[PDB]
């Protein structure tokens, strides 16, 4: 089927910038017609994908200028020549030229900012989950810049994977930065089994890792 | 121009999923237009599905091509969209496209209209109210100039709750995270910061409303 990659999937820019963003496809999309069904779709936030650009390089009607497509075969490039506030959300590229009809992942245009550490807090079961058979240790980590951070839980020095939950809120509208919370769900029972509780994050504003713990008996 | 979808909004796993858009502004017969539904999972990207041509030819995506029916009744101006045996992975946003061209180079088309979409959450819980739960840290965290307290809303079904601190009057230095479906139910969190000469000397509370099960809760944050 026809792989659609796109790249970057994540553009921080200031707005006022160039952004460009590349659509490679795994095969050609020329369709048997001639034309190249390739289309760039925006996904605003709370809105619906509105279409801005279609057989490569031809500009919907209402899409500013600004907007440009180019490409050929196989690579493909969308650009804004100075990005604006309105501008800010998902774009995807489109192949309608195969079936299955294929989209890159999208690219989230979004705010740069300075680097900025997370404040991380990390929480105890409450007395109240406990008595239901149930045991949470929840792991904030908030306020930071960039987006990319890995978080870790850690349980008496050995690495937990299962019974997480994790969600992140969108980048803020004042500050710019993101948070994240962690859930690691455990049974009671297991929860009174181990001592210590350590959520461990790598973030680029920390040369080492960024740790908060707790033991069960302190 | 206007497309519309409408839907269940909740299915249970098993049950088939009947979607429909319907049309105004335009006569479908007329146009020539092809129509399709794309949908977007929680937490992924756009998903074509199925398009169906004016002549009623139709095309799917073989990934779920056995559990997808597309149809249309050009008398009603509608699109119907059918998914069988429906599960989690099914929850998403519908979105109908019609796949419009200026009028007639039929060659150059492209989705130019989109409904505003239709969500699907599937599930297998019955209406299930939050358990509401403190977070407190623990006392070698409270040493600090700041604090950060925390409440974590788990197993709800369905969406929305709507969660406050100190009944709205604590917003400032506030973070409440999107809700996530996980083993069928809901569990959100939130975390709030406050100077350390603000807590535990005053009360802090957070307040959780679930409409569905018409639940309100309070939960003092008492230190440990
Ligand atoms: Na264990
Ligand atoms: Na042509
Ligand atoms: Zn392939």
């Known amino acids: 089927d026809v792989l659609m990659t796109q790249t970057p999937l994540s553009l921080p820019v200031n707005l006022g910038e160039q952004a460009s963003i590349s659509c490679r496809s795994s095969?050609?999309?020329?369709?048997?017609?001639?034309?190249?069904?390739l289309e760039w779709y925006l996904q605003r936030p709370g809105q619906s994908p509105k279409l801005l650009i279609y057989?490569?390089?031809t500009r919907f009607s209402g899409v500013p200028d600004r907007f440009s497509g180019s490409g050929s075969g196989t690579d493909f490039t969308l650009r804004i020549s100075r990005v604006e506030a309105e501008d800010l959300g998902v774009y995807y590229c489109f192949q309608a030229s195969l079936v299955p009809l294929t989209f890159g992942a999208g690219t989230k245009l979004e705010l740069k900012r300075a680097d900025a550490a997370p404040t991380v807090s990390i929480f105890p079961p409450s007395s109240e989950q406990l008595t239901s058979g149930g045991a949470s240790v929840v792991c904030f980590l908030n306020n930071f810049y960039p987006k990319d951070i890995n978080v870790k839980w850690k349980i008496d020095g050995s690495e937990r994977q299962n019974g997480v939950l994790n969600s992140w809120t969108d980048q803020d509208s004042k500050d710019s930065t993101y948070s994240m919370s962690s859930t690691l769900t455990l049974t009671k029972d297991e929860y009174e089994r181990h001592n210590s509780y350590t959520c461990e994050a790598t973030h680029k504003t920390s040369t080492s890792p960024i740790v908060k713990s707790f033991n069960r008996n302190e | 121009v206007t497309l519309k979808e409408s839907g269940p909004g909740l299915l249970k796993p098993s049950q088939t999923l009947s979607l429909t858009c319907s049309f105004s502004?335009?006569?479908?017969?007329?146009?020539?237009?092809?129509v399709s539904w794309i949908r977007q999972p929680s937490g992924k990207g756009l998903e074509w599905l199925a398009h169906?041509?004016?002549?009623?030819?139709?095309r799917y995506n073989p990934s779920l091509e056995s559990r997808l029916t597309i149809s249309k009744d050009t008398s009603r101006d509608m699109v119907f969209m059918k998914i069988t045996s429906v599960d989690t992975a099914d929850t998403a946003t519908y979105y109908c496209?019609?796949?419009?061209?200026?009028?007639?180079?039929?060659?150059?088309?492209?989705?130019?209209?989109w409904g505003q979409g239709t969500t699907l959450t599937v599930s297998s819980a019955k209406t299930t109210a939050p358990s509401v739960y403190p977070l407190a840290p623990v006392c070698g965290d409270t040493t600090g100039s700041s604090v950060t307290l925390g409440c974590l809303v788990k197993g709800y079904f369905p969406e929305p709750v709507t969660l406050t601190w100190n009944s709205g009057s604590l917003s400032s230095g506030v973070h409440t995270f999107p809700a996530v479906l996980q083993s069928d139910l809901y569990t959100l969190s939130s975390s709030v910061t406050v100077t350390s000469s603000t807590w535990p000397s005053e009360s802090i509370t957070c307040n959780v409303a679930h409409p569905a099960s018409s639940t309100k809760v309070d939960k003092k944050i008492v230190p440990r």
């Open positions: 496209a019609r796949r419009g061209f200026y009028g007639r180079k039929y060659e150059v088309n492209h989705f130019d209209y």
């Open positions: 095969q050609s999309i020329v369709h048997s017609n001639g034309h190249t069904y």
């Open positions: 169906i041509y004016w002549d009623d030819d139709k």
């Open positions: 502004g335009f006569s479908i017969r007329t146009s020539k237009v092809g």
């Open positions: 057989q490569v390089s």
